[PDB]
Design a protein around this ligand. Structure first.
Ligand code: CLA
Ligand code: CLA
Ligand code: CLA
Ligand code: CLA
Ligand code: CLA
Ligand code: CLA
Ligand SMILES: CCCCCCCCCCCCCCCCCC(=O)OC[C@H](CO[C@@H]1O[C@H](CO)[C@H](O)[C@H](O)[C@H]1O)OC(=O)CCCCCCCCCCCCCCCCC
Ligand SMILES: CCCCCCCCCCCCCCCC(=O)OC[C@H](CO[C@@H]1O[C@H](CS(=O)(=O)O)[C@@H](O)[C@H](O)[C@H]1O)OC(=O)CCCCCCCCCCCCCCC
Ligand SMILES: CC1=C(C#C/C(C)=C/C=C/C(C)=C/C=C/C=C(C)/C=C/C=C(\C)C#CC2=C(C)C[C@@H](O)CC2(C)C)C(C)(C)C[C@H](O)C1
Ligand SMILES: CC1=C(C#C/C(C)=C/C=C/C(C)=C/C=C/C=C(C)/C=C/C=C(C)/C=C/C2=C(C)CCCC2(C)C)C(C)(C)C[C@H](O)C1
Ligand SMILES: CC1=CCCC(C)(C)[C@H]1/C=C/C(C)=C/C=C/C(C)=C/C=C/C=C(C)/C=C/C=C(C)/C=C/C1=C(C)CCCC1(C)C
Lengths: 45, 172, 35, 178, 173, 42, 51, 57, 52
């Protein structure tokens, strides 16, 4: 049983919720600069 | 001038075959004139051939066709010939021709220079000169409309009575 | 028992998704020495 | 200043007539409170999904792939008959398509910030709609087909849910409700 | 300035006489308080419903569709409560009057005439004199049918027989 | 039948844009315009 | 001006909250509250267990 | 090499320009500068909790 | 958990060898992937790029 899933209705939230969170995160990331930097971390937000 | 009370659409301003100003609903206001005239000639020619073929079918059949198709005409003939593959062959080859007809319509609408219904099919140079060509255009359009109404009449007569054209008009 | 299971799966997925996409959101920049 | 679709209602302020498919049909005033680019993008996406969906509804019953679990003319039951792993693979592939074709701009506040027409996903392999008037005619045709396909997909799905019969088969075997 | 219809009552201050059927009849004075445009909208819609209902009663008594069972119009209401056709009818009425709400809001804002949905598909009324005459006839028929539909329903309730059936044998009780 | 320039093979279709006639076997037969979308050499 | 997710991340990682939440707190707070609730109720009134 | 970029490869349609629904420009993409998405959701909610119905009477 | 054991419960050598084939294929494909690519923008924002 993959991910403890025995009913196919359980897959709907497990896949769906990360999609919506990724949509919000993708709006955030599209707001960003997204070019390469030479440093230990990116100070641009 | 067809209907004295009303007026023709501004697309109907002469310079077209059969233009008697008859378009009360206003199809030419929203549809291009070339597409309309091409469709009119296509429907007219299809109905001309259909009516003549139906008359011939109710008069005399081909040798050996009654053994397979039986005593079936019009709609039963179609229902048997779709299973036989005759209508399938007709569909394939006529759609193959309509591919070239389609690109002809496209080139007409984008401005190649051809007129609606002009496929260049003039064997024996019949009616290719002077005012005879325009008279043949008018005759073709009027006879196409007449054959359209007649084809509808034949189909609905077989729907109502179950008899062919030449036997319905003699057995009222 | 299935309704409770799907509610729990939805809640766990929601909070784990928030965690995962929050630490992906340039967490190293969120320090007082930035800029 | 009455709308063309609703002669008894005034024309919506955001529906001037420059956008394609506009006959002034916004009775509830969605364009006054939502981005019209977002609304048109959603309308076109729904309509394209529904056009392909109606095509699938008509095709699946007459022809199906020769695969186990792929023999079900009723598409609603075919959703549960096809293995779910392939359905989720379809879901993730379409999600990747959505990611790529929007350049990672998915929220309403970021989708049109880079500059993009609503529904313009850069898909014209035949290089059509270079002509502006042809572009307008094709846009009107696309919108009319989108709305018609949304309505048709809804109707066919509801009829398949109720009568348990696939389309055109339902037309040839018309069984009225009890 | 007394009322033209009621000679002992003053003419209501909001009934100038420009509306169709405005004869000055308003004893209780609902036009003094509530908006006249909304009241005319309600009057016209009540009347249109009642006219369709009276014509429907006549037709249903004289002819029922062969795929529907044969019965009286009034007790068919419960049959279509159970069957589901009445739910469809009120569903589509609600769908039309969802936009009716927007039309009423525009009427409140003053950008629409009362009862004017611009529904003239056959082009019967285009001349202004004919339009005014048709407005007067429409409001008179609306009032007459508003009375008549209640008459039909109550006569069926007391006599247990339909309209033309009661006109057949006039039983008095 | 009507005056105008058309293809040698099909008389109701014009000569295609990229079928100039330099290549052999070219009777001007390209109704769907495959030569307009892709290169004539390929 | 910022996106909704950016404002959510600014609130989660905010130093102005009385108790700091953070992304680890996103996982921590509901888990610890669930454990606390179940522990309190099971310590007060839970039937005997066949250990 | 081809591109169909010659000035004859244009789309065709039977519909004239005078038919309703045809816009003025090809791809307009209007500038919004209006109420936010949250305010739009609040408006859709006000469809439910304050419809313009009893304001008539 | 008990009765399932995740990947500790491999109970035959066929699964072991087949999944080692899978691991080798995945590792080689990913190695060429990392030889020929540079980290994406989300990975560049996510991680700290230092030896420690
Ligand atoms: C345009 C409409 C039309 C359609 C749909 C059909 C369809 C059909 N025809 Mg028909 N036919 C047509 C025009 C048409 N024909 C014309 C214009 C003529 C006069 C030449 C005929 C003369 C004709 C005969 C004599 C017979 C048929 C028959 C048939 C049936 C068998 C197929 C066949 O051999 O066709 C043959 C069709 C042709 C050879 C006509 C092609 C030539 C013209 C120029 C096109 C088929 C349903 C047969 C039938 O009824 O089976 C019982 C049959 O015996 N047709
Ligand atoms: C296009 C018109 C056309 C023509 C000219 C013929 C001509 C002929 N058919 Mg025929 N046939 C046609 C259409 C036509 N068919 C169509 C459309 C069908 C399909 C229903 C048939 C099905 C058919 C059968 C089943 C048979 C013939 C047969 C024949 C031959 C009969 C010999 C004779 O009397 O002399 C003759 C050569 C007979 C034969 O000997 O041919 C093998 C025969 O048995 N035909
Ligand atoms: C009697 C009807 C009739 C008439 C008057 C015309 C007239 C015309 N057609 Mg036409 N056509 C018709 C029927 C007719 N068509 C039908 C039924 C078809 C379908 C096959 C076509 C398909 C067609 C094409 C594809 C083209 C034309 C074209 C033309 C034009 C030039 C050719 C010409 O002069 O032919 C004169 C034709 C006749 C005098 C018809 C003779 C009738 C015979 C004798 C009937 C046979 C007996 C039968 C069993 C009954 C001209 C205006 C061309 C065009 O548009 O150029 C301007 C062209 O490209 N036609
Ligand atoms: C956009 C809506 C939509 C959706 C949700 C589905 C969903 C599905 N289709 Mg389907 N299909 C669609 C459009 C759609 N299709 C279109 C437009 C066509 C016409 C080409 C088909 C033709 C089609 C066939 C022939 C079959 C399916 C089948 C299926 C099922 C198995 C997945 C599969 O192999 O699909 C394959 C789908 C395609 C190859 C079409 C993709 C073309 C574009 C990109 C969409 C699945 C439920 C199978 C089935 O019936 O299972 C019981 C099957 O055998 N589809
Ligand atoms: C699996 C990942 C995935 C992701 C990240 C997206 C992302 C997006 N989709 Mg989407 N979509 C997907 C899969 C996905 N799609 C699939 C598989 C389908 C078919 C069932 C759809 C059908 C779909 C529709 C019908 C619509 C979106 C819309 C959207 C956008 C807004 C979504 C939102 O805010 O809620 C965004 C670009 C909406 C949009 O773009 O509105 C402007 C919209 O109307 N999508
Ligand atoms: C020791 C094993 C190892 C390590 C440390 C990494 C490390 C990394 N991989 Mg990676 N990868 C590996 C094996 C490994 N890979 C293998 C075997 C495959 C083949 C399945 C891949 C396929 C892969 C993809 C497809 C992607 C990464 C990406 C990444 C980066 C971000 C990963 C993340 O956030 O999660 C990171 C540099 C991401 C990246 O930044 O791409 C360069 C990305 O998109 N990896
Ligand atoms: C990677 C770690 C970093 C991840 C970042 C996200 C943090 C996530 C926080 C973890 C919370 C998730 C809890 C779910 C775990 C759980 O018990 O699932 C419980 C489910 C099982 O679920 C049960 O399954 C049963 C099977 O018969 C039945 O179906 C039960 O109904 C079902 O509840 O397990 C999984 O989904 C396991 C997935 C594979 C994980 C294996 C790795 C774990 C071993 C390594 C970790 C230790 C080191
Ligand atoms: C959709 C129809 C429409 O309105 O748009 C008009 C064009 C057709 O005009 C095109 O026009 C071509 C002539 S030209 O481009 O104007 O010179 C002509 O070949 C043909 O009519 C057609 O291909 O759209 C098409 O139908 C594309 C042609 C379909 C086949 C493409 C060939 C390569 C396949 C890949
Ligand atoms: C864009 C683009 C391209 C392209 C493309 C493509 C792929 C274009 C595809 C377009 C498609 C597939 C359009 C499909 C529309 C379907 C509709 C409207 C269905 C309506 C259903 C109805 C009315 C119904 C119904 C019914 C109901 C509800 C009840 C039933 O009892 C009865 C019934 C069945 C009648 C190409 C490739 C050319 C290149 C170009 O450069 C760019
Ligand atoms: C509930 C229910 C149903 C129902 C129902 C329905 C729809 C019931 C409807 C009942 C209605 C519409 C009654 C209307 C009565 C009107 C009257 C008395 C007007 C009198 C006017 C006068 C006297 C005018 C007087 C006058 C005035 C003022 C002005 C001029 C002078 C004069 C002419 C004298 C069903 C059928 C659906 C079934 C369901 O299971 C149960
Ligand atoms: C089947 C079996 C029997 C016995 C032998 C055999 C080898 C065959 C065995 C197994 C075969 C196979 C195919 C094994 C595959 C194992 C795999 C895919 C292991 C991968 C584990 C992935 C892990 C930890 C991911 C860790 C990354 C995390 C958390 C997140 C990092 C970050 C992101 C992306 C989100 C926010 C937080 C942070 C830190 C910025």
């Amino acid at each position: 049983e993959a991910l403890g899933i025995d009913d196919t209705r359980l897959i709907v939230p497990v896949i769906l919720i990360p999609v919506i969170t990724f949509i919000l995160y993708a709006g955030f990331a599209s707001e960003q600069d997204n070019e390469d930097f030479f440093d230990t971390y990116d100070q641009r937000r | 001038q067809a209907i004295p009370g009303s007026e023709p659409p501004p697309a109907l301003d002469g310079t077209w075959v059969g233009d008697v100003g008859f378009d009360p609903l206003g199809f030419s206001r929203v549809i291009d004139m070339r597409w309309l005239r091409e469709a009119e000639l296509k429907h007219g020619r299809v109905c001309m051939l259909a009516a003549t073929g139906m008359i011939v079918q109710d008069i005399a059949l081909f040798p050996g066709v009654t053994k397979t198709f039986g005593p079936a005409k019009i709609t039963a003939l179609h229902d048997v010939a779709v299973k036989q593959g005759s209508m399938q062959q007709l569909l394939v080859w006529l759609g193959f021709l309509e591919i070239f007809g389609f690109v002809a319509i496209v080139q007409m609408l984008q401005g190649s220079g051809r007129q609606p219904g002009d496929f260049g099919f003039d064997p024996l140079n019949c009616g290719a000169n002077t005012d005879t060509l325009a008279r043949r255009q008018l005759v073709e359009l009027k006879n196409g409309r007449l054959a359209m109404i007649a084809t509808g009449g034949m189909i609905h007569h077989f729907f109502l009575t179950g008899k062919g054209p030449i036997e319905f008009i003699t057995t009222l | 028992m299935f309704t409770l299971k799907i509610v729990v799966y939805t809640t766990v997925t929601f909070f784990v998704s928030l965690f995962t996409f929050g630490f992906l959101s340039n967490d190293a920049s969120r320090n007082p020495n930035r800029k | 200043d009455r709308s063309y679709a609703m002669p008894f209602l005034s024309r919506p302020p955001a529906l001037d007539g420059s956008m394609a498919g506009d006959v002034g049909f916004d009775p509830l005033g969605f364009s006054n409170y939502f981005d019209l680019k977002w609304l048109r993008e959603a309308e076109l996406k729904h309509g394209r999904v529904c056009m392909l969906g109606c095509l699938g509804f008509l095709v699946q019953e007459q022809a199906n792939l020769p695969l186990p679990g792929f023999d079900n003319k009723l598409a609603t039951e075919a959703f549960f008959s096809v293995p779910a792993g392939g359905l989720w693979q379809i879901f993730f592939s379409l999600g990747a398509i959505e990611i790529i074709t929007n350049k990672g701009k998915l929220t309403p506040g970021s989708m049109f910030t880079g500059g993009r027409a609503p529904g313009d996903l850069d898909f014209d392999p035949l290089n059509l709609s270079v002509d502006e008037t042809a572009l307008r005619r094709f846009e009107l045709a696309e919108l009319k087909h989108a709305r018609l396909a949304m309505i048709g997909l809804g109707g066919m799905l509801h009829q398949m849910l109720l009568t348990k019969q696939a389309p055109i088969e339902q037309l040839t075997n018309f069984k009225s409700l009890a | 300035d007394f009322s033209a219809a009621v000679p002992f009552l003053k003419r209501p201050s909001n009934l100038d006489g420009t509306l169709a059927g405005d004869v000055g009849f308003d004893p209780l004075g609902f036009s003094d308080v509530f908006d006249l445009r909304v009241l005319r909208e309600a009057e016209l819609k009540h009347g249109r419903f009642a006219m369709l209902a009276v014509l429907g009663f006549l037709v249903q008594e004289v002819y029922t569709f062969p795929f529907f069972p044969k019965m009286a119009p009034v007790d068919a209401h419960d049959y279509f409560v159970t069957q589901g056709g009445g739910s469809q009818i009120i569903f589509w009425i609600s769908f039309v009057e969802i936009f009716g709400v927007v039309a009423l809001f525009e009427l409140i804002q003053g950008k629409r005439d009362a009862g004017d949905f611009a529904f003239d598909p056959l082009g019967l009324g285009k001349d202004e004199a004919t339009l005014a005459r048709y407005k007067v006839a429409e409001i008179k028929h609306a009032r007459l049918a508003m009375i008549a539909i209640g008459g039909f329903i109550h006569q069926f309730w007391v006599t247990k027989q339909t309209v033309l059936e009661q006109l057949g044998n006039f039983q008095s009780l | 039948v009507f005056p105008g320039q058309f293809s040698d093979s099909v008389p109701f279709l014009k000569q295609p844009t990229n079928l100039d006639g330099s290549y052999v076997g070219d009777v001007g037969f390209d109704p769907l315009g495959f030569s307009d979308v892709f290169d004539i050499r390929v | 001006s910022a996106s909704a997710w950016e404002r959510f991340c600014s609130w989660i990682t905010s130093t102005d909250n009385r108790l700091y939440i953070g992304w680890f707190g996103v996982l921590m707070i509901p888990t610890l509250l669930t454990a606390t609730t179940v522990y309190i109720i099971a310590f007060v009134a839970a039937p005997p267990v066949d250990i | 090499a081809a591109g169909a970029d010659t000035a004859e490869w244009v789309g065709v349609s039977q519909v004239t320009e005078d038919a309703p629904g045809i816009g003025l420009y090809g791809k307009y993409a209007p500038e919004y500068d209006g109420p936010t998405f949250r305010e739009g959701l609040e408006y859709v909610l006000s469809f439910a909790w304050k419809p313009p119905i009893l304001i008539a009477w | 958990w008990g009765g399932d054991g995740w990947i500790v419960s491999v109970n035959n050598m066929e699964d072991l060898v087949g999944g080692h084939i899978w691991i080798g294929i995945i590792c080689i494909v990913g190695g060429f992937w990392h030889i020929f690519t540079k980290p994406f923008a989300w990975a560049r924002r996510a991680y700290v790029w230092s030896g420690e």
